[PDB]
Amino acid sequence: GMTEYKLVVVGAGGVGKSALTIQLIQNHFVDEYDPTIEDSYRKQVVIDGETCLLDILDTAGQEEYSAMRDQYMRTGEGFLCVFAINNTKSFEDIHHYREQIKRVKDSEDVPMVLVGNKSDLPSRTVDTKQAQDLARSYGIPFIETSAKTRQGVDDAFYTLVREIRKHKEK
Numbered sequence: 001g002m003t004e005y006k007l008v009v010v011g012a013g014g015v016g017k018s019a020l021t022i023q024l025i026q027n028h029f030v031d032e033y034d035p036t037i038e039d040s041y042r043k044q045v046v047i048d049g050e051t052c053l054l055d056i057l058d059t060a061g062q063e064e065y066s067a068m069r070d071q072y073m074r075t076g077e078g079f080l081c082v083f084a085i086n087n088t089k090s091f092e093d094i095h096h097y098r099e100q101i102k103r104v105k106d107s108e109d110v111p112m113v114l115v116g117n118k119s120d121l122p123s124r125t126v127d128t129k130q131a132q133d134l135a136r137s138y139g140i141p142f143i144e145t146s147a148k149t150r151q152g153v154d155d156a157f158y159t160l161v162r163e164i165r166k167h168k169e170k
Ligand SMILES: Nc1nc2c(ncn2[C@@H]2O[C@H](COP(=O)(O)OP(=O)(O)O)[C@@H](O)[C@H]2O)c(=O)[nH]1
Pocket: 011, 012, 013, 014, 015, 016, 017, 018, 019, 020, 030, 031, 032, 033, 034, 035, 117, 118, 119, 120, 121, 145, 146, 147, 148, 149
């Protein structure tokens, strides 16, 4: 089989995890999607000349059992850490997602991309510079997206695969 990348989208409720995932997989923006549904999706894509399979988990936070959270975190190879630019709390939560994923995987070297979503909205509480400072501290890429206009979406997910490939080659 062609190579498959297991990607996990994490972040506070309401930040756009579902909207981003459906934009990438189905190329449309969804106004409402039950905030409690946690599904995964497959899409074949070409990234820098490589035909590959993306397997993306759109997380919904708590699980029936905490062992399930641990299971997706060990299985997933890269993590999109999403906040919304209009939700300071979602940005603060990023510290906790960072910590947890590293701690389940028992690794200092986990492919992640920091994503500030809803960039189309006028309302902003999190400035670009503050998110840049965070990403610099983590040594990972940062991208601002709009699930609504699709701006930065393929960049966010393809950048994550690129981080995974850097990780593999060590
Ligand atoms: N304007 C705008 N709204 C968005 C964007 N992403 C998500 N939303 C909306 O924000 C709400 C939460 O999105 P959702 O994908 O359910 O968030 P999730 O809880 O992280 O899965 C929904 O009403 C979406 O339509 C975006 O980039 N721009």
